[PDB]
Amino acid sequence: TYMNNTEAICDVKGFAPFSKDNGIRIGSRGHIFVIREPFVSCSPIECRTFFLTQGSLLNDKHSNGTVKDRSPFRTLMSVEVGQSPNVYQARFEAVAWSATACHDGKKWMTVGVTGPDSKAVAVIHYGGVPTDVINSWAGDILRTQESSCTCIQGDCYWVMTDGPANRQAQYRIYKANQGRIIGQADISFNGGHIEECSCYPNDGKVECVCRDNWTGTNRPVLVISPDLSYRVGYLCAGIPSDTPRGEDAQFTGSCTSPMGNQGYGVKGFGFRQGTDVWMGRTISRTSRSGFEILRIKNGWTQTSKEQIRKQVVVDNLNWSGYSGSFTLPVELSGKDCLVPCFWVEMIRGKPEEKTIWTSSSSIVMCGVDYEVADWSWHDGAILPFDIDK
Amino acid sequence: TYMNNTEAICDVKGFAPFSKDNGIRIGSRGHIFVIREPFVSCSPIECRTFFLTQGSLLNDKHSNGTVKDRSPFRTLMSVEVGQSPNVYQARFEAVAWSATACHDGKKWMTVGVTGPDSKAVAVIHYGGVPTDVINSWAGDILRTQESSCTCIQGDCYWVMTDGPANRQAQYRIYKANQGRIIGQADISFNGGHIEECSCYPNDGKVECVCRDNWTGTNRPVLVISPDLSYRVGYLCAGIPSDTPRGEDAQFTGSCTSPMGNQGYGVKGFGFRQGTDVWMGRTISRTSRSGFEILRIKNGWTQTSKEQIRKQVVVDNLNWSGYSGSFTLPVELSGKDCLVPCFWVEMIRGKPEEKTIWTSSSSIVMCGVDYEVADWSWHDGAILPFDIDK
């Protein structure tokens, strides 16, 4: 049976802790993959953490991080949410140095990108076997989102970028059924930049909050309809949520253009709430440290600066990183709306700390009907480690 | 299908060994979580051991026990009963430094408390996803039982405390269906103290034997009806079963008030048997060492001192700790009563032994129709360990 996912996103007043994997603390002694991107996606039976491994373990010499990001060894794997990315519980998914994954209600579909920068291949898997491919259309690091893709009534959707990471690139919507491409669309976005989209289903559409790695410190926003027509622009709110970024006071919002005139970025997310938005961001404006989520009244549709809620989940003394969106399937939450959820990656090691390696662990939060107090569910590993000596 | 759990508790003459996990002995070399509270709860398919981890492994530097009890890293996880709390067999349950869990016959419901002492959040999970929350109502370490909660005909019940741990606090009964709160009640108990309840279903009610951490060396007793009306008081028996406590000879029982005038305590349990009671306690009156279970004739309803049975399961040369109640589901035992069962936590390390760490393992016993001989199923680990050097 296909998941509908046609419902509204739940209006939430805050976010409750779902899981914490403690991967790096455990990896001090246990057998844990070195990873990045521990994103979460759910079937109607369970939620899983997906991740990119380098084929190496924490506290081992192969965790030497001199080896390139897009290596022959990178592979998408997964465990149940809350479990560490340990070897002995891991399900293999795809060969990938960039990835996305989602469930249509019957099976898991994953997409793994590997191969050379100049001509990469994305391999779509469905139910445990490859079913289709997408080759690089523009010859420059074909790449996906690094979070959950989005299945609505049996058809699944995701966004891909091919081209420069610090200039104008090319962006495409892909649609598949049962692991087979049934439609695609070019995203016209001159002046704009789209990387690493965080999507969720809402009102029968796919909504995505992405990363501008060119000039924007506000986040691009894509709203995809089932027929592949779309709306694209920026998160209207007059508060920047990318990193690096300037102060809130020095920012004017925009629904259409990138603002802030800064390079770089970090993958992030946001949730529409009628006309409001929940927006994640690191606490530091310059570093990937701390994590907070703000509700901006009318921030989805207006250049609003009306901040009505603020919740801290990782304090500014602690390293964060990537963040992404997913929803709880109706079959699991028991609700008649789509509970909005996010994961926060917590990066340990290089370049901020004195080790030969880099990994991350995660905390996952789910939208609830109540205000939830500030705290810090930080990584907690004690660095440096044994191999670092 | 919901479990009825409307049956009488079985009248038992003694207790047979169910399981022993040997976690710490195994953790000398294997990959085992450092834990506390290895409580047991059963679905109609199996019984699982739940536990609190600190995100660290035995024989690893992160097992340094200087890190606070209620830390960002603590997480409720579980394995099948008898298995060590090893990483590679563990199911993730909830972020929690205090917890309870039980099965309604369809799915597992768990409750995990985390967040700051002044404003803690309890996150209810049902079928693997968070479904509801309870925030601290009195601002002082919201906390649950650390043993199995209790599901009767599809509705599940548990007790929570918020407030001082050595003075008058506030106590509440919570009721949920399918992970959603459908009722609650304040427990009026002036002069009394309720911590860490050990509950079981009996005659269509929930009966709880708890821990008075204020002045009582006898144990408080709560009897909860489905409509949330209740009876609360103390275990009538003229024999104290908390720790620390005085000698039996210097004790007068009470059905209504705390007796003994001593602070502190340890989580424990008892089982109604008509008007008799089975009561667990450590053998030492001052230390958490040894474990014995006594049957007191008319000890549930009278200030009785008539001890008619005594069974030792952990000798006084060996460390014990927490103890808690659960029942065998009718679907598993094949009986028409609810087989009463308990677990005994066996704490190793600080503060009694010369190590940097603290963990525990467990032995689980189930009520049988026969007298069972004294023995000692103690932890057995050889301390100190490698990191302790």
Place this chain on the structure above:
Amino acid sequence: TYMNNTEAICDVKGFAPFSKDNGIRIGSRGHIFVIREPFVSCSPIECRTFFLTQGSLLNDKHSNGTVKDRSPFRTLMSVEVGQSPNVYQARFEAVAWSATACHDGKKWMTVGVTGPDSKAVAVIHYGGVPTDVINSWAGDILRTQESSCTCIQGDCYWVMTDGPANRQAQYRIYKANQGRIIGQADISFNGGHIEECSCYPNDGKVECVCRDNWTGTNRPVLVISPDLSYRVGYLCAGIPSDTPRGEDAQFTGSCTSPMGNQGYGVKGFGFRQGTDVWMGRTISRTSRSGFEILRIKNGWTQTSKEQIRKQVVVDNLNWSGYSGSFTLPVELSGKDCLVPCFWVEMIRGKPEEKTIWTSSSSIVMCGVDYEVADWSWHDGAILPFDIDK
């Protein structure tokens, strides 16, 4: 659905390798329980290896074998046949320093004996929970077989001994349905000795070949009918198959009495084949080294010395140990007879080798319609190990 197991044992001309777990070789680096008695029993879905652990791992200090045989820590656990007794694949079964286990077609029934020598308790488990008990009836090390018990048409049968291990003891047949004792019988056997029976179903009866630890170098034989009437005696064959034992030439067989006048023994097995018997034994007459299986024509019913087949599975340069019987369920083999099968335990360490520890691994063989060549599937571990230094 209950297994019938009412069929004839298959007539076989030899034995084919089923599995080898390589536990000790793997345990040089992996996380493997120290064990003894790796017996095999099958459900209609799979065959599992059961074993006794001491709660310790190979290459760890807790594997120090100074700790008593019948310790508080011993526990019955299991894995699928061919898998090493590693921690992370192990299913917990029972607290036990002596054990038996079998499947009735619906669930697993196990029996674990633990507690003090003077008053031991045997706890019967059914479907993962304890369901019944047997206390020591004669006060001297209550104990079972250490191999598969036997289920026929839903009722399961096993043999137990209580009393001296080197003199006249007491022996009993037990019968259970769904983990509940429904019948028992005393075995009258003056002059005889029964230990560690290896049973299988055949023609609607349970046949057992056991170990005389008193004076017999031939093996006692018990044939149990469903109503608990029985036939008891010795394996008629004029060839001794216990260890230690004398030469074949110096032996006269007996159907009724122990022959050989020697103490000690080793658990072993045999299979009726019409009037023939397959009999296992170590190759050495004095040591537990080597393993061979002989077919003696008319050896079940006559003092025959007519040896018609001989197959070696472990050469005399290599350590063996215990051996036991089980059958392939009809639902798995696809046959209309009960394929006879055995396991050979291979003991490494003390007292024969220079280590602080003792464990064993196994090879499992199944009866086939063809003559199978001699070879040696010995343990293969390289001793001593790391902790031994």
Place this chain on the structure above:
Amino acid sequence: TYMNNTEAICDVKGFAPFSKDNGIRIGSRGHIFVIREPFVSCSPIECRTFFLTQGSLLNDKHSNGTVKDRSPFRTLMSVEVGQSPNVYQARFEAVAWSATACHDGKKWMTVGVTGPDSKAVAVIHYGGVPTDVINSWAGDILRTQESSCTCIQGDCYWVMTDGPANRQAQYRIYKANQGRIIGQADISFNGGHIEECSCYPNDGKVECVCRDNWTGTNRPVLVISPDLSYRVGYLCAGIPSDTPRGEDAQFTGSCTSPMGNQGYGVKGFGFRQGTDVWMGRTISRTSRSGFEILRIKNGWTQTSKEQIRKQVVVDNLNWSGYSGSFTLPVELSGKDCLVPCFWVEMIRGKPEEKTIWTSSSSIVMCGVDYEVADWSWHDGAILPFDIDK
């Protein structure tokens, strides 16, 4: 339900990455079997990697590779495709120093060969238990293919060799249903040599591309019909694909005879594509390094040298090894043809590198409708390892 496997092989323009296990990189720290032959075979539910272990782990002294190839310890085991051959995820299959395995749609059938060189035994397993045997018919190392066997409409087929490995030997087709031999055939092939066949189903027949270890640098080709009649010869293409071999320019193809006049070989594969063939081979003509797959137009039926496609998957700077064929079941791919797939073993250690041990890892590729760019998914382990010092 039996798998049909009566469909045509899909015509493919190239091959997409399916999985990479990274076993040796992981085995630097994790608990990974030392293996060879990581072949892949699929049920309608999943694809598994099968492998031969020596009962030892990477980075352990038992991985000393002085121990013979056909040892008492070798055992066929399996994991899901993409997973490392780690202990704690491994399913035991058979005792074997040579093996094959395939799924008929209901259960797994495996065949494991063990025992002495002069009189080996092959034990057929079906659904987890041995069901039949084949003894050596010619007394000289009975042996199978080391890749997936082939099930068509419930009957499974495989090729076996018995006799010299560098001269004329004897070759046989075996056919089984439900693990029971129902037919066999001798392969008449004077002057020819057949080893280690790589088979797949195509048009209702089994097609096999094998290894001539006698004089052929081209590969023998066997086409088996359900009634055991067959066609046997050499891959017609005028391009040699065994290793060692000469240059392409110095080669004339043959449909009937071995060409090249060289000894030795390596297991390989090829796929019929109408009259074309996809042929795998190492890049080096003399070493097992690099891996490429070529499409030769009319190369199945003619001495063609018309190379129309070439795809590199392992570069010539990196070690390869064995390679083998399997297909995606229709139930998994969703197609109406049989997606052709292969695995490439990547051997690390002796004799090419300075270590005491030898293992391999793998990359698996599946046929797709698009041209896929050259890359190198090599093993990646950093040698030597810890025990090598």
